[PDB]
């Protein structure tokens, strides 16, 4: 069955400035600016009401109707990112060897850089370079906590996942060796 018309609505706050041209969404907010290319999905954008963006598909199948929900959630997450931001709090725990984490900001690349040392007493020095816009700090309120903050949910969550995957125990019992860096809390900055 080919559905004649299907539509979705995205409310936009007063602080948010959205510019869409040729399926290239640019979202401006108090915290910053995000840009995304949605040219791979056939969507017609409109302004159905003051402060509401209308997504529509004409003569699309069920898959084409369902893709509008992904587009809606992506644009909504961009709005939430430029308005309140995203924050992943991670905890690194250890059994015997204390894990040393040093956070720097490489200025020529303009990006944060997390250096992990003394994981299970290994002499290798692990290094993860963050996505641009992701700010990493060591939490002073709690113990052995990193805080990753940003406007891009994908960038923040992928950087947190990279930190979690780079410290992985190999050839050992995971029931006995519990060490690593884990994503503890996921939320908004504001």
């Amino acid at each position: 069955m080919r559905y004649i018309h299907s539509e979705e609505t995205i409310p936009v706050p007063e602080n948010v400035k959205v510019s869409i041209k040729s399926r290239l969404v640019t979202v401006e907010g108090p915290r910053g600016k995000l840009q995304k290319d949605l040219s791979h999905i056939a969507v017609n954008f409109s302004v159905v009401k003051k402060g509401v963006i209308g997504l529509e598909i004409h003569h699309g199948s069920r898959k084409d109707v369902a893709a509008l929900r992904t587009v809606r959630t992506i644009i909504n997450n961009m709005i939430i990112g430029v308005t309140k931001g995203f924050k992943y709090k991670m905890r690194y725990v250890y059994a015997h060897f204390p894990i040393n984490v040093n956070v720097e900001k490489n200025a020529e690349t303009g990006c944060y850089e997390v250096e992990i040392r003394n994981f299970i007493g290994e002499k290798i020095v692990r290094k993860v370079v963050m996505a641009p816009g992701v700010e990493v700090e060591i939490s002073k309120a709690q113990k052995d906590e990193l805080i990753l903050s940003g406007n891009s949910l994908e960038a923040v969550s992928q950087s947190a996942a990279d930190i979690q995957q780079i410290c992985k125990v190999r050839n050992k019992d995971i029931r006995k060796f519990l060490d690593g860096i884990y994503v503890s809390e996921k939320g908004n900055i504001v």
Partner: protein, 245 residues
Amino acid sequence: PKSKRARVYHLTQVNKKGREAKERLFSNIRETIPKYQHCFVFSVDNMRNNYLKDVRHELNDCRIFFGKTKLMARALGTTPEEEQADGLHRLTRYLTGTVGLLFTNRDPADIESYFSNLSQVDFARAGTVAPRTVTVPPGIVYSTGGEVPPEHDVPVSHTLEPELRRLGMPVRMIKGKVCLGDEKGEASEGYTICKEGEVLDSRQTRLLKLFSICLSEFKVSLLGYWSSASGEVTELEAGKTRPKR
């Protein structure tokens, strides 16, 4: 539509009730009416409602119905051409939200006095405003989280700490003990579950329930009552304030 959610079939004894339970509720309400002079409507909004069994036990001579609101309204009769007795469609305008019916032989003043002096401290649900600030102190976690002195408290169970980490408390296992930070207590501050003048969410209320901290009250508010002899509905204080349908 091959890609569909697999509907899990439950291998348990109790099944869905269905239309038969609705008809049973209709029969019970329509048979309770010619036996009692007064029919009260009470409201319990945003409440746990597990002391209603104790209320039922204490009111032995009374009958309490706590079913679906629209089903009880249809049982009593929404229109004057449908009501079982006169003035019951006047009473049905009080039934919205979480309400209940109380068929009684007693005095309305006695019922009001009982439901006024009845008060039990109960766990808060999501949406209520926190009356105070609760902070679990650093160090070893106990069962109450600092409500009683720590020297009079058992340490909290080791099986609860994955739930505490899921609910956001940064606990860890140190020698079989749940702790914030270090065992003696260092390099961290106390975990603030809630702050005063803040709407509680379900995570905070679940934490308070796990630490046995009660921040609410069990108050049943009587909205009005229909009398069989006079054939009229007397409205009480909460009836003016509560929304009407």
